[PDB]
């Protein structure tokens, strides 16, 4: 496992790692305070699957409730206390310990732009006039006011000034918190629009300057104004200013977008298809998400955007050959059956020395997405859907099959 910043200072922990999101969002519904339990008695699986880091649920205890239904999966936290639905303080110091004992790095899911403000037993409490809440300051709209630098959560009546001296301090300390007796290597940074990217930097030098970061920007150009640069901007230009800014990589919802809305071939589209290098290393190529995706139990979840069972191995096909950083669906793993599919990919990336900022050329003359990919050690040809028929067809050298799935239709081979 190789450490450093990129040549940009994005803290992308040396490019190399492969992410598993350690959760879907019923969780808290199909395995009540055992969650982290399970997770310690897996550490050695997720490890032996080929993991480096492991993207864990929001620590923070959350016992909200709002009705189909939902509640307590942690983005509406009250406290910084522990011992909520996924297990108590203990059962996560166990679990840490377990994974980052296998070897897997243990990123902590942060939620600094809102909490659960009328949650009555709380031991957190911040008062109204003082200036620590966005709704200290007059609320036109979602858009920053001057108790908020970033966009609000619903109504804006939960949203905290991150800003606030107090509430940056805050924020700052629970961080340094869970890097000292968390084991956290890192932090997954939700709803970056609520607050300024220049806030993430900071957090991230004063608590944990070396580790890996990403942040959650899901904002297309139409939700910009018309006076915005961003309005006319793609969604890969959107992300990577983030990134610049925050000084960490972002999830490639430039990818995720043509996933749901283009071709296969259009998924070269994405951030981590980019030809600068300094663009594509940034990129966090997923999936689906908690968010975005099915889990499991109760309503299916969220599924706000999912991928169709169709494209669910051409999918990580890509994300797992390609440029980039990826990350793993919990329940495309183990719950759903792609688990096999998934680590005979990871053993691919692997052997073949794909890291963040590989070189990845789309060939134009074939049916479906046809990429050379240069990792460090091997060079792969990927045929998803393709007409193509040997390797040879769009790369010199000579070339073995490495997977062969869903009938032709996922196709990879080493150098
Ligand atoms: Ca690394
Ligand atoms: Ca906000």
Redesign the pocket.
């Known amino acids: 496992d190789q450490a450093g910043k990129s040549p940009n200072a994005v803290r992308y922990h040396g490019g190399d790692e492969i992410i598993l999101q350690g959760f879907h969002w019923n969780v808290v519904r199909e395995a009540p305070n055992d969650w982290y339990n399970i997770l310690r008695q897996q550490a050695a699986t997720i490890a032996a699957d080929g993991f480096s880091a492991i993207w864990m649920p929001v620590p923070w205890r959350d016992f909200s409730s709002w009705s189909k239904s939902g509640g307590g999966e942690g983005y509406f936290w009250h406290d910084f206390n522990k011992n909520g639905r996924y297990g108590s303080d203990a059962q996560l110091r166990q679990a840490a310990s377990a994974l980052g004992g296998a070897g897997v790095k243990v990123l902590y899911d942060v939620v600094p732009?809102?909490m659960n403000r009328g949650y009555p037993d709380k031991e957190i409490n911040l008062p109204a006039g003082q200036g620590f809440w966005?709704n200290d300051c007059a609320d036109p709209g979602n858009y920053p006011n001057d108790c908020?630098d970033?966009?609000?959560?619903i109504g804006?009546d939960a949203?905290?000034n991150?800003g606030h001296p107090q509430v940056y301090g805050m924020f700052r300390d629970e961080f340094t918190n869970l890097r000292s007796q968390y084991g956290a290597g890192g932090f997954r940074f939700d709803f970056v629009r609520?607050?300024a990217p220049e806030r993430v930097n900071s957090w991230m030098t004063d608590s944990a300057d070396n580790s890996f970061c990403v942040g959650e920007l899901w904002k297309g150009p139409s939700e910009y104004p018309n006076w915005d640069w961003r309005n006319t901007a793609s969604w890969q230009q959107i992300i990577k200013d983030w990134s610049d800014r925050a000084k960490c990589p972002v999830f490639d919802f430039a990818l995720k977008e043509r996933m749901q809305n283009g071709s296969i071939a259009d998924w070269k589209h994405g951030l981590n298809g980019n030809p600068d290098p300094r663009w594509r290393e940034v990129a966090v190529t997923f999936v689906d998400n908690h968010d975005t995706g099915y889990s499991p139990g109760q309503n299916g979840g969220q599924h706000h955007w999912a991928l169709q069972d169709g494209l669910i191995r051409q999918a990580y096909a890509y994300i797992l050959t390609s440029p980039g950083t990826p990350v793993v669906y919990w329940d495309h793993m183990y719950d759903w059956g792609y688990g096999d599919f998934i680590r005979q990919l990871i053993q691919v990336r692997r052997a073949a020395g794909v890291r963040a900022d590989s070189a990845i050329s789309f060939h134009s003359g074939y049916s479906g997405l046809v990429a050379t990919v240069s990792g460090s050690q091997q060079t792969l040809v990927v045929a998803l859907n393709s007409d193509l028929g040997n390797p040879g067809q769009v790369a010199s050298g000579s070339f073995s099959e490495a997977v062969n799935a869903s009938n032709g239709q996922v196709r990879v081979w080493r150098s």
Request: hydrophobic content about 15%; aromatic content about 14%.
């Open positions: 732009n809102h966005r908020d970033g966009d609000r959560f804006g949203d905290l991150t609520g607050y």
